[PDB]
Amino acid sequence: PLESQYQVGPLLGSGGFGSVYSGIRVSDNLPVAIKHVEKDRISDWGELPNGTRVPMEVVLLKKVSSGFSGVIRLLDWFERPDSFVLILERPEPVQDLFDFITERGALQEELARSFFWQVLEAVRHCHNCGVLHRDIKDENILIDLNRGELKLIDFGSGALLKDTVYTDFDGTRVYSPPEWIRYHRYHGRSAAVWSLGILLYDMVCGDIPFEHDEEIIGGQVFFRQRVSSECQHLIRWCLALRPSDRPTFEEIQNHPWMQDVLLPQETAEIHLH
Ligand SMILES: [Mg+2]
């Protein structure tokens, strides 16, 4: 049973993704997050290697589970009559990147570089596992404050990665690319790189660059804080209007701005501790 295996704590958050609670695995006192999703709110279903019918979210989380700590780990899941329950890893202490940037303002380039590098490694892992996240943004990134490790969360709007066009999108509009706004069409990799440009701007400027549809399609990035010419170059390249003009993950990680990254433990000692 589920109520015997986990001590439930306070609500951490609710919205489009469902309702998430703090919790403890009674056996070993491991910190967990307990996510509830109503069967009515699930449009996308899949099958396990098992051949069992589950939310696409469970399929995608199982595909990315491994030693690699850059993606949130699914520990267990349960089917109830009207809902699924997901048991997820909970770092402690933790802060989400949205809240961290709200509290600290625009990050120093050395810290933005460390965080952005870790997000690139996590997104490479997803893509290597056949998973497209589709909602990369500061709210979906947790910081393990003691280890200086970032984790990607909320795979519930993701998809199997494919090389053909996507004509459905239920991620965050203001991190969505101009080809989605104009044509309701995108390709996975080039739409992910757009969302990474929005995230890097968010880190170095303290907020997202565009609010309205017309700004997204307009082809102009204004820098509201002091940002190095190399960092501006990378951001403007990720936010190229034409998807085929955007860098690959390899071209981002080889960019001159991305050189000499801090290790996670150095990031924690210098910036978080
Ligand atoms: Mg979602």
Q: How far apart are CA 242 and CA 193, in angstroms?
A: 12
Give the method of determination. X-ray
Backbone angles phi, psi at 252, to 5 degrees: -65, -50
CA distance to 44, 155, 266, per residue, from 192 (Å): 20, 14, 28
Three-class secondary structure of residue 7 per DSSP: strand
Give the containing element (helix H, strand E) for 83.
strand 83-89
Q: How far apart are CA 77 and CA 98, in angstroms?
A: 27
Ligand 1 centroid–CA 229 distance in Å is 34
Give me the count of residues in the chain.
Answer: 273
Q: How far apart are CA 215 and CA 204, in angstroms?
A: 19
Q: Does the annotation list 19 as a binding residue?
A: yes
CB atoms inside a 10 Å sphere around CB 163 = 7
Backbone angles phi, psi at 170, to 5 degrees: -135, 30
Q: How far apart are CA 251 and CA 188, in angstroms?
A: 17
CB atoms inside a 10 Å sphere around CB 179 = 20
Q: How far apart are CA 3 and CA 253, in angstroms?
A: 44
Q: Which residues contact 139 (CB under 8 A, 6 or more apart)?
A: 96, 97, 98, 154, 172
Structure tokens that stand for 88 in this block = 């997820």
Q: How far apart are CA 20 and CA 85, in angstroms?
A: 10
The resolution of the experimental structure, rounded to one decimal in Å, is 2.0
How far is C-alpha 86 from the chain's CA centre? 17
CB atoms inside a 10 Å sphere around CB 212 = 11
Task: Find the DSSP H helices in the chain.
Answer: 56-64, 97-104, 109-128, 178-183, 188-205, 213-218, 229-238, 249-254, 264-267
Structure tokens that stand for 222 in this block = 């204004």
Ligand 1 centroid–CA 134 distance in Å is 8
- Enzyme catalytic residues: 135
Q: How far apart are CA 207 and CA 217, in angstroms?
A: 18
What does the longest C-alpha to C-alpha distance in the chain come to? 56
- Which DSSP state fits 72? P
CB atoms inside a 10 Å sphere around CB 105 = 10
Ligand 1 centroid–CA 115 distance in Å is 22
Ion ligand 1: residues, Cβ under 5 Å: 17, 156-157
Cα dihedral 123, 231, 252, 186 sign = positive
Q: Which of 1, 6, 3 is nearest to 28 (CA)?
A: 6
Q: How far apart are CA 139 and CA 96, in angstroms?
A: 6
Ligand 1 centroid–CA 45 distance in Å is 14
Dihedral over alpha carbons 139, 145, 148, 151 (to 10 degrees): -30
How far is C-alpha 41 from the chain's CA centre? 21
Residue 214 burial (10 A CB sphere; 0-12, 13-18, 19+): exposed
Q: Are 166 and 185 in contact (CB under 8 A)?
A: yes
Cα dihedral 217, 189, 254, 265 sign = positive
